[PDB]
Design a protein around this ligand. Structure first.
Ligand SMILES: [Cl-]
Length: 260
């Protein structure tokens, strides 16, 4: 299929095309891209479907992969679908974009593709391979099923910890405080399973994504330009060894990729 992450263009050329006229909104977006352009020369437009946040994060993480992270080296990763689904039968309410084999196939693909990218000598070889992977075919969307499953697993672990009275990060309190997401089944049914053209990860779920792939996500939030949220980092205090990926969000729903 066609690329789902568009070929790069100059970031201020992009800004000048999208943001014209003298509205306060347009002025704030221009200031936002001007600030981003101090560190990144170019931008890649990410397909704005319900997977936009996952696509943006995974494309950055994988195109920048120089090693296979320990959580993907762990043999437990491939055992997780059978162990989780056997224990929590409501997971079979999963809606795909049997279940154990499908998820295991997706996780095996994620691990294999990531390992192959980490094997490459140059960033250019990685970008070519990523440009082939993110072409709107079944392999791309299988990656999102894998990551969504790891998000569900991390959510179950955080929920169970909070039940036991163990310390949990506060974003998980906020995640489960939502009336549509009071427990992991509601998270699955009402958020991870969601309907086309309406879904996408909410702010609190960006923390969950970061935890699931062990990446620090640095987001220029342009609708927050004149506030301390002009950047938000997910999670707030990650391990220093987690790799950093940078995104741009004009609103708190759609993400593009700055590149240099
Ligand atoms: Cl033009």
């Amino acid at each position: 299929g066609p690329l789902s992450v568009a070929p790069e263009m100059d970031i201020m050329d992009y800004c000048k095309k999208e943001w014209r006229g003298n509205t306060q909104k347009a002025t704030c977006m221009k200031m936002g891209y001007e600030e981003v352009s101090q560190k990144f020369t170019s931008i890649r437009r990410v397909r704005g479907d319900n997977y936009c946040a996952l696509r943006a994060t995974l494309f950055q993480a994988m195109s920048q992969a120089v090693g296979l992270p320990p959580w993907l080296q762990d043999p437990e990763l491939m055992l997780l679908p059978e162990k989780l689904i056997s224990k929590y039968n409501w997971i079979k309410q999963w809606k795909l974009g049997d279940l154990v084999d499908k998820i295991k196939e997706s996780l095996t693909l994620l691990r294999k593709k990531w390992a192959g990218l980490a094997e490459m000598r140059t960033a250019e070889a990685r970008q070519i391979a990523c440009d082939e992977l993110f072409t709107n075919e079944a392999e791309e969307y299988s990656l999102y099923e894998a990551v969504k499953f790891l998000m569900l697993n991390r959510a179950i672990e955080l929920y169970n910890d909070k039940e036991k009275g163990k310390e949990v990060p506060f974003f998980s309190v906020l995640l489960f405080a939502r009336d549509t997401s009071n427990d992991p089944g509601q998270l699955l049914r009402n958020h991870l399973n969601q309907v086309r053209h309406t879904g996408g990860l909410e702010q609190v779920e960006m923390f969950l994504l970061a935890y699931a792939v062990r990446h620090t996500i640095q987001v220029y939030r342009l609708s927050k330009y004149n506030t301390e949220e002009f950047i938000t980092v997910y999670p707030t205090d990650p391990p220093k060894d987690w790799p950093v990926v940078t995104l741009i969000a004009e609103d708190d729903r759609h993400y593009n990729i700055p590149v240099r």
